[PDB]
Design an enzyme around this catalytic site. Structure first.
Site, PDB file in Angstrom:
ATOM      1  N   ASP A 157      42.074  39.282  48.815  1.00  0.00           N
ATOM      2  CA  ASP A 157      42.486  38.310  49.831  1.00  0.00           C
ATOM      3  C   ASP A 157      43.607  37.399  49.311  1.00  0.00           C
ATOM      4  OD1 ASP A 157      41.425  38.318  52.502  1.00  0.00           O
ATOM      5  OD2 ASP A 157      39.415  38.091  51.680  1.00  0.00           O
ATOM      6  N   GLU A 162      43.490  34.993  55.564  1.00  0.00           N
ATOM      7  CA  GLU A 162      43.117  35.531  54.258  1.00  0.00           C
ATOM      8  C   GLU A 162      42.851  34.405  53.281  1.00  0.00           C
ATOM      9  OE1 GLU A 162      43.997  39.776  55.049  1.00  0.00           O
ATOM     10  OE2 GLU A 162      42.513  38.171  55.283  1.00  0.00           O
ATOM     11  N   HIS A 199      39.418  33.191  54.044  1.00  0.00           N
ATOM     12  CA  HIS A 199      38.465  34.132  53.447  1.00  0.00           C
ATOM     13  C   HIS A 199      38.311  33.868  51.959  1.00  0.00           C
ATOM     14  CE1 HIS A 199      39.739  37.316  56.689  1.00  0.00           C
ATOM     15  NE2 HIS A 199      39.078  36.293  57.217  1.00  0.00           N
ATOM     16  N   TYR A 231      34.786  32.684  49.618  1.00  0.00           N
ATOM     17  CA  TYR A 231      34.091  33.240  48.456  1.00  0.00           C
ATOM     18  C   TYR A 231      33.770  32.128  47.455  1.00  0.00           C
ATOM     19  CZ  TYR A 231      36.198  37.572  50.275  1.00  0.00           C
ATOM     20  OH  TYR A 231      36.626  38.582  51.078  1.00  0.00           O
ATOM     21  N   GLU A 234      43.458  46.389  53.829  1.00  0.00           N
ATOM     22  CA  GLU A 234      42.617  45.809  54.887  1.00  0.00           C
ATOM     23  C   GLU A 234      41.436  46.693  55.253  1.00  0.00           C
ATOM     24  OE1 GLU A 234      45.080  42.301  56.128  1.00  0.00           O
ATOM     25  OE2 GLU A 234      42.956  42.895  56.122  1.00  0.00           O
ATOM     26  N   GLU A 243      39.224  41.396  59.074  1.00  0.00           N
ATOM     27  CA  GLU A 243      39.995  42.464  58.418  1.00  0.00           C
ATOM     28  C   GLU A 243      40.140  43.673  59.336  1.00  0.00           C
ATOM     29  OE1 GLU A 243      41.019  40.709  56.359  1.00  0.00           O
ATOM     30  OE2 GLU A 243      39.768  40.184  54.621  1.00  0.00           O
ATOM     31  N   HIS A 290      43.010  42.987  61.526  1.00  0.00           N
ATOM     32  CA  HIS A 290      44.232  43.006  60.728  1.00  0.00           C
ATOM     33  C   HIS A 290      44.699  44.442  60.527  1.00  0.00           C
ATOM     34  CE1 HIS A 290      43.084  38.938  58.565  1.00  0.00           C
ATOM     35  NE2 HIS A 290      43.184  38.811  59.876  1.00  0.00           N
TER      36      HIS A 290
HETATM   37 MN   LIG Z   1      43.056  40.915  56.362  1.00  0.00          MN
HETATM   38 MN   LIG Z   2      40.747  38.554  54.277  1.00  0.00          MN
END
Ligand SMILES: [Mn+2]
Ligand SMILES: [Mn+2]
Ligand SMILES: [Mn+2]
Ligand SMILES: [Mn+2]
Lengths: 288, 288
Positions: free
Chosen positions: A62, A93, A96, A100, A161, A195, A198
């Site tokens: 990401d 991204e 994302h 994490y 992706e 994703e 995407h």
């Molecule tokens: Mn993506």
């Molecule tokens: Mn992502």
């Protein structure tokens, strides 16, 4: 110099993807993960290590998609509406990647987290796979690019992706499908929902460019695409062996990798290259 | 290869800006502007043309910031947390650009809208000013950039964020401060709240890079920045004369341009270059 004008459509799909990006908007503060601690501590040491490692790998992918893959493709688009969509996908991204870190804070100490990120940075297979993808992006760091170069950056992006994430997404889904780490699993499901769109969208843009290439150039990028698919597959098989042997899941993850590789090929308008197999039933429950 | 790790801060400010970007998140679907038609029709043709023209110019600047300024600066920024913030800011520029189209749909017919976008694309001063800014961005289309190149791109970005937009933002604020086009004014105020934080943030990054330069490189970029300010100022003064002479507002806009130019300089850690003049009281009411 042109400004984006949404009153005059530049294609038949960017508006729908723009709206869907936004409809799917989320951030990590929406899902608390403290309740996963009860099942986290019940995992074995080997299970916990595998989970942290795959999260580290996902964070790397990401990071590179938000910081290279989306920006460098978008810069070279002539279609200002599609450019708008890619800018938003790139921002997601980064959402994302930050999510994490939010999971890590519940599952690990500050020192354990920094250890994982050092393991990511020095990992030879992660370095190799990220290097292969980003080489296509970095080719675009010049004022004038060819359509072959832009197409191959879009192929690499679809492969990231729709394919390269999945050796990592497997484990959060597999645990969540058993009722373990379900809140972290909810976050991963939100990431996957992003994703998946995407990969579809970049695959549409790639097919448009492909249709403009000469027959000779089409041959050349078809060959590069099939070779790249298999170059990445060899690395993925080494990665799954390394991560999942200790917990007995290598062949299950490999099946999931092949399933998602086929989806990436489909997003590019290409035929599958791996035999059809049904998805692991626990993973499927984790997606539910 | 490194992944972004929010557990280890890269600086003392990126997290706060990341959180604030998100806290400020909005999209056009949130503000209907149909109720502005009643005050739109109260305006004269000259007032309406000025409004549509300045919105066209704003759209152009946001198009270039989302599609070139944010992506190319962020790609070359080493700090992965600050890179994340810039990716989000770039996506918000595309939200802003799309919101102008939403305003246009209420205020104009499809044919009138496409004529405004043709006027933007062919306009000599808009082309000149956009070309000056984007020339610094396009210098970053290379595998590695010098710190001087990156600094000057950040200067150009702050000048766009904190200065070049304001000859355009003037008129929606002026009308809203008189109770006219207030729904569109609310949208513009949300845009301004975003651009203000964009300019502060890029200005922090610029000051950090500047301090890393050799003394000879600092002297070079200091001079170039002061020249660039005044090159843009000459163009802005021609632009304001062209747009606002028909409605008697040229000197008022020029005062507002200078006020915002000073704020851009302050965001870069530089002294003001224009005399202090109090903000126009009608504009102030439109910001309220
Ligand atoms: Mn993506
Ligand atoms: Mn992502
Ligand atoms: Mn903007
Ligand atoms: Mn901005």
């Amino acid at each position: 110099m042109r400004a984006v004008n949404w009153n005059k459509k530049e294609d038949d799909f960017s508006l729908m993807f723009w709206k869907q990006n936004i409809a799917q908007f989320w951030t990590e503060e929406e899902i608390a993960v403290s309740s996963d601690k009860n099942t986290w501590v019940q995992l074995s040491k080997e299970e916990q290590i595998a989970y942290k490692r795959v999260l580290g790998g996902l964070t790397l992918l990401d990071t590179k998609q938000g910081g290279e893959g989306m920006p460098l493709v978008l810069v070279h688009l002539e279609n200002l509406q599609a450019k708008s969509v890619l800018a938003f996908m790139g921002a997601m991204e980064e959402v994302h990647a930050k999510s994490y870190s939010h999971i890590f804070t519940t599952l690990a100490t500050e020192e354990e987290i920094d250890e994982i990120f050092d393991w990511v940075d020095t990992h030879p297979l992660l370095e190799k796979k990220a290097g292969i993808i980003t080489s296509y992006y970095r080719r675009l760091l010049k004022p004038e690019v060819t359509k072959k170069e832009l197409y191959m950056a879009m192929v690499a992006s679809v492969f990231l992706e729709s394919y390269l994430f999945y050796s990592g997404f497997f484990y959060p889904l597999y645990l969540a499908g058993q009722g373990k780490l379900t809140a972290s699993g909810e976050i991963i499901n939100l990431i996957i929902r992003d994703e998946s769109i995407h990969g579809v969208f970049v695959g549409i843009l790639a097919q448009q460019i492909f249709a403009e290439l000469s027959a000779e150039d089409q041959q050349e990028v078809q060959k590069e695409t099939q070779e790249l698919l298999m170059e990445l597959y060899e690395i993925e098989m080494a990665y799954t062996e390394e991560i999942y042997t200790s917990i007995g899941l290598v062949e299950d993850v490999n099946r999931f990798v092949r399933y998602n590789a086929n989806k990436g090929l489909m997003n590019l308008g290409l035929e599958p290259k791996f035999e059809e197999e049904e998805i692991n039933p626990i993973v499927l429950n984790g997606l539910r």
